[PDB]
Structure formats: C-alpha cells, structure tokens
Design a protein around this ligand. Structure first.
Ligand code: 91Z
Ligand code: 91Z
Ligand code: CA
Ligand code: CA
Ligand code: CL
Lengths: 306, 306
C-alpha cells in the first residue's frame, strides 16, 4: 500500500546524456545512435536571445564549432542541421548505450519523467504532466536546457519532451524531439505568457480511485450524477470537460473498486462544492491531477520495465 | 525556478537489481561484486511468517536452493550466510556494473531515493524520509521486498535501506544493508505498531527557505524569536525540538536569503498558530518536512552525480 509521485527508472536515459558547447554556451544533448539532439539556442550568446535569426547564426558555424562531451570522452561532430527548434549533430561514434526508443508527441493531461541534467550530468528525476495550457510545473535552473522527459514501456524509451525555457510564474515550456514546441511558445526572449490552466478532471478521478484502493474512502457519498450535470459543475471550478473516452479509460479502476465512474463523479462534485473541511486524501489537502489512470494501475499493480 | 520532490538518478542501482527465489518465494536482491544481499524471509513459506526460526529454516537450505537471476542470466550461488535480518549469497560472477558504493545507516530526518522493484525489475523511483518513528511513507506492494533506498554523492552510491515490511496505516519498515532494522520492528507477522510520528522541524525550515528562493514570500513576518520560545511552540504541534546543530546546518540557506534562522522560526511559529488561511507555499496547502537543507541547496544549486 501507499501512493507516491513516482518517476520511471532513469538508467536508460542517463546513458544518452551529453554536454554540447558552442562558444560561451553549454547545455545538455541527447545522444541516440550517431546523432546528438539539443536546443538550437546553444548557438546564441546573451544579446542574441531577444530575437535570434537561428538559420543565419547557424551558417557562421562549422561541425568543429560544436564541442560534444560524453563524460570525459569528446565526440567528433561530422554533420549538423536544424529541425524546427532542435539541432541534430551527427557524430563519428554511435552511442553503445542507445536504448530501444521512439519520439512521441504527448497529449495534454499525460504524464512523463524529467531527468534534470547540468553539463551533461544527471541531477534528479521527477514525474510531470503536460498541463492543458502546454506548460509543465518543473524544477529547472540555467544549464538544464536539453534535459529530456520520457516514458518507459517495458524496454522502449518514448522521448516526449526537451527543455528550452521558463515562463512567468515558474512554469516551463519545451519541444518534442522533432523540435516543435508544446503550446504557442517560441525560443526568443519576448513577453510570452501561459494560457490560463485548467485541472485535468480524468486524472483527479484516477487519484480518488487510488485513494479508495489504499483505504482512504471518507469522501465517497451515496449519490450518482449524469455526465452532463457533472460537467456543468466541473466548469465553475476550472476543470476540463470529462468525455466518454475519459469514462472508458477509467473503466478498469471502476471495475477493480466496484465504484461506477458516474458515482465517483458525484463524490468529486461534492468535494468541489463543499471543500475537504481540513481532511486529507492520500496525505494531500488539495485534489491531485498529475496521476493518469495508467499511472494509478501501474503503481497499484507493480508493473516493471527492462 | 520551481521546486519538485526529486529522486536521485537510479541508473547505478538499476544495474545491481536481481531476482532471488527460494521455493515459492521470489523477491529482489542487490548484487554488488560477487555477493547478493536480500531479506532473510525469502526462506519462509506463508505459514512460517507468524514466528519463523530463521537460523533453523536456513540450515535446511543448500546454495543450489537459491535461484538468482540477473535479467535472463542465472547466477550460480557458491555460498550463503545470514547477517541479522539479511542473507548474503556469494555468487561465482562479480557484478560488472557494481558502482562505487558504501553501506550507511541514515539518521531520522534524512532523505533517500527508493527504487521500487518487482521480480528484480525496477518499477519506479521516489524520494522518502526516515521518519522520527523509524518508518517511511513508501509505495510498496507484495513482491517489493529487497528494494533498496540510496543517496548518490558524485560517483558513490550510499545504500541506507532494504525493504522488509508494511505496518498499520500504510507505512513501511526495513533494515540497513547490515540487516539491522530501523526502529523497534522485527521480521515476524506479529502485532507491531509505529511510534507516534513527529514533524521534522529543520526540514520544514529548509522548505520555507526553498519557498523564499522561489519567490513565495507571503508568510515572512516582521518578528524574531529565541530558540527556547520557538521550541515551546513547536512542542504543542508535535514538531521535533530544533537544536543548535539544526540552526548551524540552516546557516548557508540563511546567508543565501538574508533571513536569520530565528527570524524564519518566528514565521513558522505564526503559521503553526494561525494556519495558512487557504494559501499555498510552493503549491502545497500543508507544511512539507521531507526536504533536508542539503536537498534544498542541491535542487536550487543544480548539483550533479557521475
Ligand atoms: C536554457 O537555455 C538553459 N541554458 O538552461 C534556459 C533554461 C531556463 C533558465 C531559468 N530556468 C529555465 O528553465 N532557457 C532560457 O534561458 C530561455 C532561452 C531564452 C530565454 N529563456 C528563458 O527561459 C526566459 N525566461 C523568462 C521567464 F521565465 C519569465 C519572464 F518574465 C521572462 C523570461 F525571459 C530562450 C527562450 C531562447
Ligand atoms: C515482502 O516480503 C515482499 N515479498 O514484498 C513484503 C512486503 C509487504 C507486502 C505489502 N506491502 C509490503 O511492503 N513483506 C511482508 O509481507 C512482511 C513479512 C511478513 C509480514 N509482512 C508484512 O509486511 C505484514 N504487514 C502487516 C501490516 F502492514 C499491517 C498489519 F496490521 C499486519 C501486518 F502483518 C514479514 C514481516 C516477515
Ligand atoms: Ca579539434
Ligand atoms: Ca542446477
Ligand atoms: Cl497539499
């Protein structure tokens, strides 16, 4: 028993982390086979960043301008191109530790692990969600750019995120591994603000199922609701609409606990309208929306990876 | 910016995890050089566990009775002994992935990462604290026994915990790597209860320093207090006494923020007596006591490991 915010084991991603230096700028790179992926603003100095011409700045650079280190060892760059907001540096050595991997673009509401890195060396690992407003609530300092976020499915690392920037309010923005931003953000030092966020309703329900499984059951009421009446209440409290797909995805947790999704919706409606009255659920005083239904089943079923 | 509950990168510990089977019972082992460390109750069946004679049960076992798998590969056991609550199985192959490591016995209040494992395969990683009552608030299912907890100091893995058991209220108990229990617990299925817990005062202060560093400053008052007057208030709210050692350990965060430890004590006293009035600190509605001063400086300074 017990429920913790749990990250994927980081070992397969640790073996892929390198340092990329171009001039004054060092950040992190991801070394898969014979390619290093990093943020394209490694080619910028301090003044450049207000409004850089990347395509232009990159012409003034030769392969030899990029210093790539995998721990001690220097990797020799033998090619380089820009894809959207990411650099691909071809190196003369394939990474012998390259895991089986995929590049995925995750959906808002989905979770992943971040391996926070400085100078190509891993700092820590923590679980995040892609917020509805396409930001993450991370912990990133200057030097963390190029750190990646990922899921592991048995032996396969699905890379979904590369860190580029911080926004007002201490939230973070980045790209998929094809260098396309999540949300409307751009890799320029301009006035950019995150959209208003919303609470990921399906994840809050998944977490109430995690509470029941763990014997924290005080908030279960005797009532049901319709999907329509539920979404009218959710709307007031800045919660995303619950869809039928969301209901279907909650099916297995519903069946394991013997609590219909619409009955759990009736309990969430009461919590939203009445508050928690100083009580906790799974040790928390606020409703948690950063656990997917999959995360709940995995953690409560003890699913493992290669 | 941003503050997350962050685990150590798990890669060095992942390479040490194996499966140990004795009869019907499979749990996890830690393979360092040519020795596998696991919980000694791997030699028990279901009925044994009410009050096992370990010394006795272990005599009926030969080396060949222990099936040890490192992924696919079987390891051949060529020796076995019991040290307190742990088995040492000598194997004919030294682990080529053995990191530089130490066995440490941590102090209550100190944090570590758990690599949750099933059938020798890693599940997830999360940060825990050794509670004052010698329990941890973990996430452990049947099959997780032998999972280890650890700190990384640059290249060196300090093993401090091996998982043995769950207690009433969904909290967990285990041993150091010399097989001695943290707290008064025993590896028998008896009525055992955790002592009353207390809040780790020094860690709450470290976390308020983390809030200020991150620009969450609303709870800072204009007052100071003496150490004695502070500890009289702490006592009422079931907080540990703050010692001079604790004050000295908070010195660097005090200096970085320009807030004397006794001034921050005055602010915590007001929070304890008045509550948070529906406000949050670093996104939390409750005071957090599972971040050490070291954890705060590391996460806010971007310290990395080999
Ligand atoms: C990254 O380049 C690195 N070397 O680590 C760095 C990471 C951030 C520093 C602080 N925390 C981070 O995650 N990224 C950047 O410096 C990016 C790059 C230029 C500006 N920028 C920002 O993050 C700007 N941040 C910012 C705010 F957070 C808030 C605000 F009001 C204005 C800001 F500029 C690029 C986007 C090219
Ligand atoms: C471990 O042996 C394994 N194979 O994973 C297992 C781990 C626990 C199962 C549930 N969560 C765990 O962390 N340990 C045990 O089964 C230990 C071993 C015998 C009993 N036991 C318990 O954990 C008993 N738990 C228990 C309570 F949690 C609460 C309660 F009121 C009574 C209990 F027995 C040993 C201690 C030898
Ligand atoms: Ca050269
Ligand atoms: Ca044999
Ligand atoms: Cl909370």
């Amino acid at each position: 028993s017990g429920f913790r915010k749990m990250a994927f084991p980081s070992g397969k991603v640790e073996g892929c982390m390198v340092q990329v230096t171009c001039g004054t700028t060092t950040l992190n790179g991801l070394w898969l086979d014979d390619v290093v992926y990093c943020p394209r603003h490694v080619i910028c100095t301090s003044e450049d960043m207000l409004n850089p011409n990347y395509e232009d700045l990159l012409i003034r650079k030769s392969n030899h301008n990029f210093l790539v280190q995998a721990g001690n060892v220097q990797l020799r760059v033998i090619g380089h191109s820009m894809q959207n907001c990411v650099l691909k540096l071809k190196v003369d050595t394939a990474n012998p530790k390259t895991p089986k991997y995929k590049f995925v673009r995750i959906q808002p509401g989905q979770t992943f692990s971040v391996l926070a890195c400085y100078n190509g060396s891993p700092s820590g690992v923590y679980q995040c969600a892609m917020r509805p407003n396409f930001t993450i609530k991370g912990s990133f300092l200057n030097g963390s750019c190029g750190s990646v976020g990922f899921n592991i499915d048995y032996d396969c690392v699905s890379f979904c995120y590369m860190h580029h920037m911080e926004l007002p309010t201490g939230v973070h923005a980045g790209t998929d591994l094809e260098g396309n931003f999540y949300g409307p953000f751009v890799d320029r030092q301009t006035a950019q603000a995150a959209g208003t966020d919303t609470t990921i309703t399906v994840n809050v329900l998944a977490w109430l199922y995690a509470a029941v499984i763990n014997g924290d059951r005080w908030f279960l009421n005797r009532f049901t609701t319709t999907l329509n009446d539920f979404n009218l209440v959710a709307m007031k409290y800045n919660y995303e609409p619950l869809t039928q797909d969301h209901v279907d995805i909650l099916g297995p947790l519903s069946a394991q606990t013997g609590i219909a999704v619409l009955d759990m919706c009736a309990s969430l409606k009461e919590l939203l309208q009445n508050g928690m009255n100083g009580r906790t659920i799974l040790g928390s005083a606020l409703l948690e929306d950063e656990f997917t239904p999959f995360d709940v089943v995995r953690q409560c079923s003890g699913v493992t990876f290669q």
